[PDB]
Amino acid sequence: QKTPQIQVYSRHPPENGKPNILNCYVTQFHPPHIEIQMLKNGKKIPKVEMSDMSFSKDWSFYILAHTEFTPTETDTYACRVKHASMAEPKTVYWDRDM
């Protein structure tokens, strides 16, 4: 059992009110069974696409979630991951400055 690492980042320079794409890249987890949701204001976004489950040369799994979003002054965005290596879901919030 290995714990997943979560990285959240936007495709383009974030600018409030302009449509963008938010990515959530999840790595290092084992076994490959995993649940990944992307959240807007703690609410789960409906149209979230996933890449095909792959893994690196060292056998570390990795998978890309992404969805369209329009960054804003008020809204929070987060990626929530559930995996048997963790007692609780891990949520990492999007922060355009990180």
């Binding site: 980042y9 990515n23 890249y25 489950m53 056998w59 890309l64 355009r96 400055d97 990180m98």
Partner: protein, 273 residues
Amino acid sequence: NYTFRCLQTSSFANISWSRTDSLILLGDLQTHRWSNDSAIISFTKPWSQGKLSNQQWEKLQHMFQVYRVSFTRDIQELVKMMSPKEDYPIEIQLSTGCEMYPGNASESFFHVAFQGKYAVRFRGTSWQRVLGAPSWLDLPIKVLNADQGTSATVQTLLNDTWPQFARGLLEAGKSDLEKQEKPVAWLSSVPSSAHGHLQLVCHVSGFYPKPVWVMWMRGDQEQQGTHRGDFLPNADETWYLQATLDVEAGEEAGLACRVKHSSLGGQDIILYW
């Protein structure tokens, strides 16, 4: 150099329940998809047939179809008979392909991970256990090695199919593999827990191909404290990368982020704080 690779992930949970999913990649571009839900291999690129005519691709394609059903029942039979532990759950990862060297030179491989760990390889004519793998795997390995019909097929894969198919893929997708997409840079900073300290971040997204050079500069001088993050993928198979520099308060003024990429010619991106 490009690594051609078929990556298979297989999960056996209880006596009824298994699924096998796989994809094929050439370098960092995906060329094929095979979900457990589909009966047949999909293309994910226009050139994913490489140079095979239809007849030969269909032969390779049917070969995959028989294998997936054969593979699934084999593992469960092998593990049920010889695993000194319970025969579920089983996680198998599988990587076979060849590394492409310029000038028509290749090097094939077939690697198998068992419960998340490198366990088996295929060299010459036989499967071989690797250092560190559970010793009891010796018995299923010997049983698999008595199947010379399968051994011969794998030999043909490693000696002929993968090198020749991937050379045709490489040339049918040369334009895609060599397209140039430009990076786009933007800057941000985050506080440190300590006062007077903060961390500059230079975000660089959208570039292809992958090799790129991102540094924090003060004029001529490279700031050696620059920390390059990991290459992160974008949905359009461009790349994302950020580089960070911890600086004392006030030192940010006059610092720039310099981006060297093959898509820019010699015109570096220079983006001052």
